[PDB]
Structures are given as structure tokens and as C-alpha cells.
Amino acid sequence: ADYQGKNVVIIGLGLTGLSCVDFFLARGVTPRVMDTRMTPPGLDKLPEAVERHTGSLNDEWLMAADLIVASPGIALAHPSLSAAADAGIEIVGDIELFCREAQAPIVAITGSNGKSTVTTLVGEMAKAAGVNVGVGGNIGLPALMLLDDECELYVLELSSFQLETTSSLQAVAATILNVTEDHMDRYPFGLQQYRAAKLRIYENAKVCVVNADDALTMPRCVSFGVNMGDYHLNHETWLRVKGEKVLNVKEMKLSGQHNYTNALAALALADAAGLPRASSLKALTTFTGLPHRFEVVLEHNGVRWINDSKATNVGSTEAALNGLHVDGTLHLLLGGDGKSADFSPLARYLNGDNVRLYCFGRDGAQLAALRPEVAEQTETMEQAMRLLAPRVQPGDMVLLSPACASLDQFKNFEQRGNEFARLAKELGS
Numbered sequence: 001a002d003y004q005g006k007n008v009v010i011i012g013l014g015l016t017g018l019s020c021v022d023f024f025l026a027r028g029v030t031p032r033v034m035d036t037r038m039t040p041p042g043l044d045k046l047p048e049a050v051e052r053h054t055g056s057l058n059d060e061w062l063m064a065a066d067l068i069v070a071s072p073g074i075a076l077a078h079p080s081l082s083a084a085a086d087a088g089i090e091i092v093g094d095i096e097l098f099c100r101e102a103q104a105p106i107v108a109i110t111g112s113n114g115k116s117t118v119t120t121l122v123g124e125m126a127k128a129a130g131v132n133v134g135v136g137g138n139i140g141l142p143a144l145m146l147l148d149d150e151c152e153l154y155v156l157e158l159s160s161f162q163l164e165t166t167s168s169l170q171a172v173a174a175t176i177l178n179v180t181e182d183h184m185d186r187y188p189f190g191l192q193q194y195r196a197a198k199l200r201i202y203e204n205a206k207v208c209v210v211n212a213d214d215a216l217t218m219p220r221c222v223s224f225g226v227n228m229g230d231y232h233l234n235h236e237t238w239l240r241v242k243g244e245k246v247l248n249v250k251e252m253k254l255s256g257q258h259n260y261t262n263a264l265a266a267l268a269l270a271d272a273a274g275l276p277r278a279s280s281l282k283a284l285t286t287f288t289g290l291p292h293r294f295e296v297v298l299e300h301n302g303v304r305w306i307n308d309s310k311a312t313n314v315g316s317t318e319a320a321l322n323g324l325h326v327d328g329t330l331h332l333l334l335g336g337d338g339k340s341a342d343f344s345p346l347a348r349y350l351n352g353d354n355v356r357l358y359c360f361g362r363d364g365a366q367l368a369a370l371r372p373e374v375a376e377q378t379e380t381m382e383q384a385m386r387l388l389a390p391r392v393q394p395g396d397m398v399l400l401s402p403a404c405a406s407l408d409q410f411k412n413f414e415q416r417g418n419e420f421a422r423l424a425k426e427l428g429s
């Protein structure tokens, strides 16, 4: 696309907003940026020649623009963006800009849970194939920063928000791993609207990879599943493709059924992208996992401290608990911005005499209510931890898998995960 002479407005700073700014400057276009936050991240890294309006949106800027580039963090339903859409002003995201430029095939991955793992695995599978691959998007580097014509493959994680402003994506392989309640604060029309956003990822996709165990992930598409699907499991556990064994999961550093289904999805995607299977399977044996994604940060004195800060929704926390083995007592930490999510689904995993809940952040109270007889409620996570540490016995597990966003008290789930690791080392000895 050609943006010359166009009046461009970017909504939202941070790394993404900056990646968008650099995108236009390099192309000889000076955009204006606005952020509803008084001091958005990156503000000081923004070139002085770039006009900025913070602390709110500027409708005079918005209605005068030829192109509005909206951060996934602002809803198209916002009246200001809504008025501009009515006026016929074109609105896009960074992912849209990226798609219009990319000169390599794109593997697009989305889903309520497992997208970063799968996106990282496909990245890993391309590296083992000797493919110059750009991995990023909703994780790692913002898509616009991955743009290089020497790049031979792009692997992008895409959120429902990003997909909402994208229309030019023609993925060589795309998937929705699953759809479970999340982001309801941004989807006033319920689960189906949320799903509708994710389904956009299949539009123009050369191959669609669906989850045979989750009907919501379906728009033929190649499928993956536990007991069924083109890519499925076999029980010792094996990853099978159309009846043929391809990998005994004991060769994987990752465990858990959902991580095995992740392996199948990554494989299905890698295959569709033409990546050599041998090297893709090798990558499945070398990947160790993502930080904050069910990460043991300390295992000392018979006690495991696991950092699953990346569990920012009920489905995710549920994955950590379903089948979880604990010798003694599970001290589970929940809390933050639950985003109006129904927490009930967790309750069935919260019975027995070996559970303790330590609920904090904005929705702490609501989280304690799952089983008030075994729950404590503090304001912060550090209080929750200094509260549980004394009660930790050999055989116990301290699990931070909050089922919520951390944006209410933290910059991001990584900050919350890192604070948990520091505290655990402190109290774990």
C-alpha cells in the first residue's frame, strides 16, 4: 500500500505504537499519535517531530485523518472510532499494515489458550529447518519490527483484538486453538462475538487448522484433537498423524495433554507451511517452554513454586489444574482484573482437603467466593504470598495461575510473574 501525503493518526503508544510510528516515518509520512493514557509507555522514545495528544482521544485529529491505525487495546466500539467508521475513514491495526507489506508466507495463530506456545513452537520448527523465520506479533516483537525481505517465514500470534482490525491476511496456515470465555470486557455481545473476531483469522487462509474437541474453533480444515482429528494422540502417549506415529511424547521436554495437543497443532501448522517434518519433530524435543507459562521457579525443601502468571483467563488456569498432581496442599493464587469472566468453571477443581486459595487484586473477593471456607483474600499478591509461605509444608505446591489479567496492579503478566519468582526465592528458603 502507498501512504504518501496521507494524514495518519496512530492510537496507542508503547512498543506497538512506536513500531507503527517508525513504519510511517521511514516511508516519509509523519503521523500523529494519541493515547487515552496521560503518559503512555514509550512517550519519551517518541520523536519530537511527531505530534502527540495524551490523556484522551482527539476527535479533531480523528475526523481529519485519512487513516486511523488503532491499537488492539482500544475498542472499535469506542464512540470516537465508531463516529470515524461512520464517516468512512479507514481504520486498521499494526497487523494490517504488516500484512500489506509482508513478502513471505504467514502462519497465523490465535486462541483463548496456548497461542504463544504454539506460535513459539512453529518458530522453533522453522529454525531447525534452517528457515530464516520472524516470530512475533501479540508476543515477542510487534509484527512491524519483524519485516525484512530476507525473511522467509513469519509466525505470528494474533489476538482477537488484532484480528478485528485485520482484513488483508491470507495465511498459508491459520488456527484458532480453542475458544473459552475471555476479554468479555471488550465483547458486550458475549462469547459468539468474541469467537466471531477469532474466526476472521481463517478468511483467505490457504489451510485452516481446527480443534476437533472445540466446535467454536470451526468456521475443509485440517484438524487436531485428543482421540480424534487428522492430528491426534495415542495411548505412554504418542502424537499421530492420520494413523501414523510420529512422536512418543516422552521425547518432549513439555508435558500435559493440552501441551500435547499444542504439539499437534504446531505440527499441523508447520506441515501446511511446507516445513520438513523431521526437523519439526526435533524442535518439539528441544523446546523447554515459555517463562510464566507453568514455570517452576523454585523447587526446594519438598515444595514446588510454579509461576503460571500467563494464565490470564479461566480456561488457562483450568488447564493448569485439570489433572494437576499435588502430594500435599495446593496453595493457589488467584486475582487481578477478571474481565467479567465467570469463575465457576474453576470450582470443580477446588474441592478436597488439600486446597488453599489466596485471592488478591480487583476481583479477589469474587475469587474467594469459589470456596470461602478454604480462601484468604488480600489486596496484593505479595501479601497473599507472605500470608501462605508460613503455611507451606514439604509436599506442597504454590501455584500462581490467577485466571485474570494483571493490568489492575501490574504492567503485564510478565511483571506479575517476575515478582512472584523473586518472592518465592525469598520465602522458599
Ligand SMILES: CCCCCOc1ccc2cc(S(=O)(=O)N[C@H](CCC(=O)O)C(=O)O)ccc2c1
Pocket (backbone or CB within 6 Å): 011, 012, 013, 034, 035, 036, 037, 071, 072, 073, 074, 159, 161, 183, 312, 404, 405, 406, 407, 411, 412, 413, 414
Ligand atoms: C490507546 C489505547 C491504549 C489502551 C491501553 O493499552 C493497551 C494496549 C494493549 C492491550 C492489550 C490487552 S490484551 O487483552 O490483549 N492482553 C491482556 C494481558 C493481561 C496481562 O498481561 O495481565 C489480556 O489478555 O487480558 C489488554 C489491554 C491493552 C491495553
